Design a protein around this ligand. Structure first.
Ligand code: ATP
Ligand code: ATP
Ligand code: MG
Ligand code: ZN
Ligand code: ZN
Lengths: 612, 604
């Protein structure tokens, strides 16, 4: 089976001439598309007559209604937009198509040759008749007799350039997808192009291909393989330094991952603290709102305020408050809205249910409510806009240490891990207060064999400190898989290798680290006191950027990603985009949750200021 | 610059008119391509006349010295070759390239257009002149005076089609790569094409670029990202089950990673055993060659012979022979050339230097020599086929309670960890075996050494638990009973711990059904581990006792695990590449070797 397709200009003999390209085998179905010019209609009748005679195969004559003649580029494109549509309907496949570019404009033959290499074809050929006919014998065949003279006298030359396989994304463009309006004005199919959709599709299938092939070299330096379809000018933008003020609208739209977030430090002051209190189940046991003054310049202080002072800023929330069932519900719902305004796709919230247990509300009752308040908010959100929330139970700070309180949280986490197997889950424990030397014994004095034997992951909170010996015991004694605020790894080069090669992730909180211990800002060169984010990446450490306390720090996740530009000199926009892939791998998520998080991470927003 | 390329034929006024595309500014140097036909010569003389009477931009006239009239596609093939090469010489840049497809045959314009669509161009226009000239005012301006009036009277209408982006890997082709010979028969540069490289290097690019696009979406499933450039038939042959008869040549040519290989069990008998004894420094001390019979069916025994009988099968080599300084070189060199013949790109050899120490050669002297016998062999191999060898020290539990050997090996590994920073390195210790939990393996962890633990012959699930969390093992050897504990099989996958599996050593020790029509209750746990997300690696263990190379071990999986595909054998190599104890420099060099996957030969 073989379709024939050719363009007809002012000479119609080409169509009967191409009929002999296969000797006497001909074509199983021929088609002719030409213009609406008044000089073409006269040739239509001749082909109709010649189609009336020798009517072996099926015939069809079509003319572009909206293309009289070539006056401007708008005309060629108009006919170009129709050729592909007509080329799909008449020719459904690419292995049966045969094309001739004899009749038509020099820009119409170019529209025929190009059109074949895009949707695939079996062959493209040309015809050239000897000018040994007509009066004086110095002209080519122009009558039904002269044409048959050259047909029977071997006066036609066929220049067959060769077949075209076609591109992969265009061999499935079916004509029904791009309908062509055909009018039956007798034996002529006058066609009209409804929309320019097909052209807007091919230009989108060949534009994306050229971008992928230009990025098939650094495809291993790209954290997200979906960045390949990005224009080369955009990929050069991605490789330049981050701008904290120009990229705010790009970082704010990134699908991010949260791994370090305390539930009790969320709404500590401002319009949010007063909103949590208004939800109290009994607005009579709420303690008086203290007056905790934020240090000057908050969120960016003038000097570090130490860890002890940093905790005290969250005294209007936490253990006091949220013991009320109504105020706890508000926190678990006002916090999920924050994770939706940051475009966070996966979050692990750190909670201490034993801090919220009253005489009638056991730690399990509190933990069961926290899980169900996030699971309801998760279910009331579209699957494409839904932030997945998992829970970590915290072995708290110096408030802990007692044997009768660090093993109650471990038992609570073990029971919860086996309880919920879908939706919001308890995925691990957070050994906070690990930097407390007194509580250090309590952490190593308690057995963690049950925690590891049930599949719960351990993350260690290496807060403000300089004891590199604690990090060694966290990796090898507690089998921790993540490290919190490990800001002095570069000092011990031998420990930086162990962390990098073993795959332990490091949780860095830009704002919390700046407000507690302080770091140089905007320095033109990397010195000795500089933030270690860029040194960890060079050493092969899987670093992640988190918020820690959305309320105490007064900075969102976007404000933490932007501060790295002013905190690490030279950090690029592919570096921040790379920490989101490290976080996705450091998350204590199962296969189902990971597969849903990579889909969200593979939707990096396109930049807008890629013009210089 | 605004270089312009013009094609000419029986009409020559196109070039003088095409030069007006830019208006009064014009071009800086317009170039013309022409054939060898005599009929075009009158235009050529007129074209030179126009150029000489219109001085300015560099004017060049080139004729196709091997094409005179369109007769067959052979002429067409020769036209494009020169055309592309001609366009690669007269117009180097893609922003200075202005092309006019008017002049020439009907197939010439397509080549002038298609070629632009492949190499790009600033513009490929089309100048049309009003037929208001000639003696009767009916023909297009043909003479010198008519062309001027056509330009002067604005009888020109240029049909601009647009610029051309081209293709990324094709928008770099320079002139010297595909040169040309221009015979100066006067002001005309008669050009000709020597070879056809500019049509085989181009036609093949679009072949590879369509494979990438087709297989790009189906990516992230290929362990090696470079496989996307494979033909779809090849990329679909990769997803079919392995066939350990027809694939003995593709598996043999694969770059492989060796993570479990014992030095002392290499040349245990046969021709290799005598080539190690033959090089002994003190032939008067070589022990007599004990008679050790191999169970019938070796390497495939009719029944599992257990571990105790397996060890005794290699009693003609090892500490018996390796205490000789000369026999320790043949072992280290006859072993490195066995990995070269197997295409191994990175290997970790397990040795016990304390078993070869005499009263004059301390364990450090033996290790000092083993390291330099591998480093010397590595440096004497080209850096293209060079297998990088690292060393693990095996601290085997002894059946005397004698833990002095354990102490010497652990101290030796810590000492050698800092000594060597390049070339062959001691990268970890092998805990081939409660005492180790009282051994205080912390010091090896503090110096950066990795730990590998052989899983005992018993189904000691509590043993694999303590290796992961007490010994902090990063790899597990012979952990065939992981599926027993569903919670353990999930901890191993989530922590990224790798499992070292030896298809022959496991078959000849425990025994597994072979070529069973479907998965059963006593099948090799390869596919079960892979499905559970466990990082699995296939090794040789003892290349001498087992009598099988790394290639044979990979093929035996086609029988132990029915339905295993050829993409899985590549996954095990990527898992090994990430489970290796190599550093960044070594890992970077190993990824380059892995990326050179051999291409399937049948595919049909
Ligand atoms: N620095 C921190 N370390 C650990 N958990 C913290 C920290 N700050 C806040 N939290 C979170 O707060 C919750 C319990 O602590 P909470 O905020 O109630 O503090 P507290 O010590 O009980 O008293 P206060 O009311 O003065 O804050 C848990 O979610 C815990 O994760
Ligand atoms: N498949 C196996 N399973 C367990 N242990 C093994 C296996 N293969 C070898 N071993 C033991 O592991 C250690 C590896 O050391 P190696 O084989 O290089 O030494 P050797 O020179 O053969 O020692 P020997 O003096 O015992 O003969 C030895 O104890 C060897 O017996
Ligand atoms: Mg031995
Ligand atoms: Zn914290
Ligand atoms: Zn072993």
């Amino acid at each position: 089976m073989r379709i024939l397709l050719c363009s007809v200009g002012t000479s119609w003999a080409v169509v009967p001439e191409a009929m002999q390209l296969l000797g006497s085998q001909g074509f199983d179905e021929v088609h002719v598309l030409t213009t609406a010019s008044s000089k073409i209609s006269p040739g239509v009748e001749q082909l109709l007559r010649y189609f009336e005679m020798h009517p072996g195969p099926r015939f069809s004559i079509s003319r572009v209604q909206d293309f009289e003649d070539l006056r401007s580029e708008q005309d060629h494109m108009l006919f170009e937009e129709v050729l592909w549509r007509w080329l799909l309907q008449r020719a459904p496949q690419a292995a049966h198509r045969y094309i001739c570019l004899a009749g038509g404009y020099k820009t119409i033959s170019a529209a025929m040759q190009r059109a074949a290499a895009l949707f695939g074809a079996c062959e493209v050929f040309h015809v050239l008749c000897e000018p040994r006919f007509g009066p004086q014998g110095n002209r080519e065949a122009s009558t039904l007799e002269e044409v048959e003279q050259a047909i029977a006298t071997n006066a036609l030359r066929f220049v067959r350039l060769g077949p075209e396989p076609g591109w992969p994304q265009l061999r499935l463009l079916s004509a029904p997808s791009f309908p062509l309006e055909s009018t039956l004005q007798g034996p002529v199919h006058w066609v009209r192009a409804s929309d320019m959709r097909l052209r807007q599709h091919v230009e989108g299938v060949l534009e994306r291909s050229r971008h992928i092939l230009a990025a098939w070299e650094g495809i291993s330096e790209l954290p997200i393989p979906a960045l390949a379809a990005w224009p080369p000018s955009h990929l050069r933008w991605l490789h330049e330094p981050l701008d904290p003020v120009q990229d705010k609208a790009w970082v704010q739209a990134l699908p991010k991952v949260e791994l370090h977030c305390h539930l009790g430090g969320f709404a500590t002051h401002g319009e949010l603290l007063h909103k949590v209190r208004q939800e109290a189940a009994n607005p009579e046991s709420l303690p008086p709102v203290r007056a905790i003054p934020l240090p000057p310049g908050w969120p960016i202080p003038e000097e570090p305020i130490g860890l002890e002072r940093y905790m005290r800023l969250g005294d209007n929330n936490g253990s006091a408050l949220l013991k009320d069932p109504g105020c706890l519900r508000a926190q678990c719902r006002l916090l999920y809205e924050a994770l939706l305004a940051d475009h966070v796709a996966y979050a692990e919230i750190r909670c201490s249910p034993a801090n919220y247990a009253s005489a009638s509300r056991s730690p399990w009752v509190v933990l069961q409510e926290i899980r169900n308040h996030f699971q309801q908010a998760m279910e009331e959100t579209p699957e494409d806009r839904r932030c997945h929330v998992n829970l970590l139970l915290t072995a708290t700070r110096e408030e802990g240490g007692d044997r009768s309180r660090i093993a109650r949280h471990l038992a609570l986490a073990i029971t919860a891990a086996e309880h919920w197997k879908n939706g919001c889950r308890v995925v691990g424990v957070d050994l906070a207060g690990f930097e407390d030397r007194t509580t250090r014994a309590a952490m190593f004095a308690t057995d963690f064999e049950p925690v590891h034997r049930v599949g719960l992951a351990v993350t260690v909170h290496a807060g403000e400190n300089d004891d590199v010996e604690g990090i060694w015991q966290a990796v090898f004694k507690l089998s921790a898989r993540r490290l919190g605020h490990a800001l002095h790894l570069s000092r011990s080069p031998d420990l930086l290798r162990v962390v990098a090669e073993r795959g332990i992730a490091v949780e860095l909180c830009p704002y919390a680290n700046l407000q507690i211990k302080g770091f140089p800002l905007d320095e033109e060169q990397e010195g000795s006191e500089t933030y270690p984010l860029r040194g960890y990446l060079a050493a092969g450490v899987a670093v992640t950027l988190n918020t820690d306390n959305l309320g105490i720090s007064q900075a969102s996740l976007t404000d933490n990603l932007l501060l790295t530009a002013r905190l690490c000199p030279g950090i690029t926009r592919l570096e921040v985009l790379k920490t989101q892939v490290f976080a996705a791998q450091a998350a204590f998520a199962n296969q189902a949750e990971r597969k849903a998080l990579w889909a969200r991470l593979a939707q990096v927003p396109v930049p807008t200021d890629t013009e210089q």
